Amino acid sequence: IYSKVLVTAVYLALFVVGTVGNTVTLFTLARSTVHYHLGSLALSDLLTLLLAMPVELYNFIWVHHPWAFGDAGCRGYYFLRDACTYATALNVASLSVERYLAICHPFKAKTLMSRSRTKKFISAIWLASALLAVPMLFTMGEQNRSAHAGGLVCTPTIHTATVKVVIQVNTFMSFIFPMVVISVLYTLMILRLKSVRLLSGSREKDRNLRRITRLVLAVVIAFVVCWLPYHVRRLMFCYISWTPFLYDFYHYFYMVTNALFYVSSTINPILYNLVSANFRHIFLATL
């Protein structure tokens, strides 16, 4: 029991901070190209905190058995977590693309990223994320488990070998591919930043660009810290078929990776206020 209250208190703290911060971020940003991407990130976070976490607390932390949400809920819950996972990584890579075009091709960017085209590119991202999460719908189901007391459970309903293929494919599409593109574009930007005397031809616009680029890079580092351990846990299920020491190391590594999933949804608003003076004043005004 003692572990349950410890985990439950950590989740509640994240839910309060995350909910208020992302909700304010939406209105604060409301009243330009950067603004839409940060808006989309706030929305992926709100879904994660409002829908995924209440299911996790009831049917995982406190009531292990039996599953209480029905077959449909079992399928819906795994589908949501994957859909949020794709949406976050895709937004951060696209946000990285907008910074790179501003620094290395300033004139070309004006047409390439236009407000009308920005609204359309974000719609595609949400549509793509839901489509990539469709396979987990079919992988998971609700089954009556005989005689570990027998009863209704949410468990994989396909062969265990095929399940491993689904987990590995998601790791590459959701994490490895985004990291390669983000690494290459940021490497290029820093080489330009360390060389050019003035960007955009004025001091004020140069100073503005450097501050915004620094803010986005902080978003990237927080993303790598939270998500990379989570993929390593998933990769252990596939390749790591124990003593008392090893058992405990695996138990705690699993719980730590679960908390990190929610921490990712709460970090951004905090970063925005620290890095930017202007956002803080408007945010403080709205909050």
């Binding site: 930043l193 360390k194 005397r197 003035l198 140069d206 100073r207 450097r210 501050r211 680029t213 620094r214």
Partner: protein, 60 residues
């Protein structure tokens, strides 16, 4: 932080140095002599203190 004498202090990069008459730039393009490595050229110098900072000019 920047000090003018040759320049020393905490400088990420030095850009346009000239006599205030003539000016010299990193790479040597000039309008009216420079030792780029030595950080040596009223004397006014353009500089930056970090990669993320704004461009500033300081006098000696």
């Amino acid at each position: 932080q920047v000090q003018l004498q040759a320049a020393s202090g905490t400088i990420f990069r030095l850009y346009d140095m000239g006599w205030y008459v003539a000016s010299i730039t990193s790479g040597g393009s000039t309008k009216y002599s420079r030792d780029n490595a030595k950080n040596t050229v009223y004397c006014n110098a353009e500089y930056r203190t970090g990669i993320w900072e704004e461009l500033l000019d300081g006098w000696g």
